[PDB]
Design a protein around this ligand. Structure first.
Ligand SMILES: Nc1ncnc2c1ncn2[C@@H]1O[C@H](COP(=O)(O)OP(=O)(O)O)[C@@H](O)[C@H]1O
Ligand SMILES: Nc1ncnc2c1ncn2[C@@H]1O[C@H](COP(=O)(O)OP(=O)(O)O)[C@@H](O)[C@H]1O
Lengths: 136, 114, 136, 115
């Protein structure tokens, strides 16, 4: 066992800082650039996702990241206290987004899905979101 | 986070990125580029991702956004010097359909009449 | 105006990540490097207190750093919920240390003051020690 | 984060440090030195902080720890190649009235009458 939690403001200026931090703490597991970049990209997806879907770019919002490490698993849970998801099945579908206006693609969860062993999401409208990611 | 070098070879805009292309930076690029398409009559874009260190979905998004404006003028969007992890995104989002890849920058220019 | 909050197991192999993740955040201001050496050291002294003292090296304890930036100044906080301090007046007294056996110099607190501009130790027996160092 | 290069010349033990000398890493330094003094007749110690990119109070202690170890057999401890950062922590405490700081390993060994 060994764990970490990191909260920060919903500003994209902290997304690179957050991506790295999550990566560095995972470093303790002697992981590769393939594993290291996957985890990092899977985190920006979920972090930047917690910023413009749950907190609509209001800097006054705080994102949470949980990287609990047990045996060989990187338990990652980025989380939100924002809008939430009305239709999970609909977003969990390839290439679906709700901001054609910021030029979004819908890959967020497919990347999460593909770069992580499990992407569980529990979200209640205006209760916020919680992405229970996993990997080994 | 990102270094953006742009060069216009006639009706071809060459965008040379160095650094990270994530939500924050994509917007700066999405911003610097559009200013060229408005001031100059660009038909195609060459996009040199050789010195890029990272990219998320926002990168796929900003690039797809540039193809649209490029599809209008009947031009090609050529992304060259692509690193695997990136090639891996193009390969997962099917961006490849709309975007052509080349070994280096000079093979991109050969594709676009030069 | 931005902020960040880290928390992690009370294992010694987290103390570098702690500083590093703070320096990573405190960098936006574009500081002098000595300013970053001071911060990393300070953080390292407080976090070390928490783990080796506050939590008596008990890995279960959770060290809690938080960085608040506003109008330029830095407001670094560090809290723990362990034994706490009996005497805040006998503690700030230079060279004093309860774990002499553990080759503990008794410099930790005196270092926070040479580096940081303002210091404020807030502790409570068994409630946990909360320290606030501010750098302007 | 912290690497250690040890070497025993005559009755002196030269300890060279690369990296961040802190609480976590200060323990391997202790094990080895204390271990080494436990195995050999060491009268003096020369600590080369030349490659030290970070030292905290958890580092002064490992030093003072050894400082008292050598004091017990009437020898000295000399530190050399000390950065500005590290050198500042020596003034803060008041160790600038405890060990011998020289400029490099050679003047350190010179200060010890090393052949
Ligand atoms: N934290 C969140 N709060 C609200 N909706 C979210 C959140 N995260 C994801 N979603 C929903 O899922 C959709 C798909 O997300 P994703 O696959 O990452 O693509 P994109 O970010 O390009 O929209 C989003 O457009 C949004 O409707
Ligand atoms: N977080 C804490 N919890 C409990 N006691 C603390 C804490 N921080 C400091 N102290 C008390 O103050 C003493 C001196 O601390 P300091 O000046 O940092 O030196 P050192 O850490 O080397 O002992 C400690 O030995 C302990 O008795």
């Amino acid at each position: 066992r060994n764990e970490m939690h990191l909260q920060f403001s919903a500003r994209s200026e902290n997304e690179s800082f957050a991506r790295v931090t999550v990566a560095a703490f995972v470093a303790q597991l002697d992981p590769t650039m393939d594993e290291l970049t996957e985890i990092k990209t899977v985190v920006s997806e979920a972090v930047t996702n917690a910023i413009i879907h749950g907190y609509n770019n209001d800097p006054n919002g705080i994102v949470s990241i949980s990287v609990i490490i047990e045996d060989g698993v990187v338990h990652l849970t980025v989380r939100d206290e924002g809008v939430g998801i009305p239709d999970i099945e609909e977003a969990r579908q390839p290439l679906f987004t709700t901001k054609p206006e910021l030029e979004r693609s819908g890959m967020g969860f497919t990347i999460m899905e593909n770069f992580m062993d499990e992407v569980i999401v529990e979200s209640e409208v205006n209760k916020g979101t919680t992405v229970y990611l996993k990997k080994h | 986070s990102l270094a953006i070098d742009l060069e216009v070879k006639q009706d071809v805009l060459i965008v040379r990125l160095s650094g990270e292309l994530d939500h924050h930076t994509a917007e700066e690029l999405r911003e610097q580029v559009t200013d060229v398409l408005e001031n100059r009559a660009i038909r195609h874009i060459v996009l040199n991702l050789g010195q890029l260190t990272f990219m998320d979905s926002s990168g796929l998004g900003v690039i797809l956004g540039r193809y649209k404006q490029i599809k209008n003028v009947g031009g090609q969007m050529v992304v060259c010097a692509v690193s695997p992890a990136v090639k891996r995104l193009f390969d997962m989002s099917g961006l490849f359909k709309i975007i052509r890849v080349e070994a280096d920058e000079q093979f991109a220019l050969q594709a676009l009449g030069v």
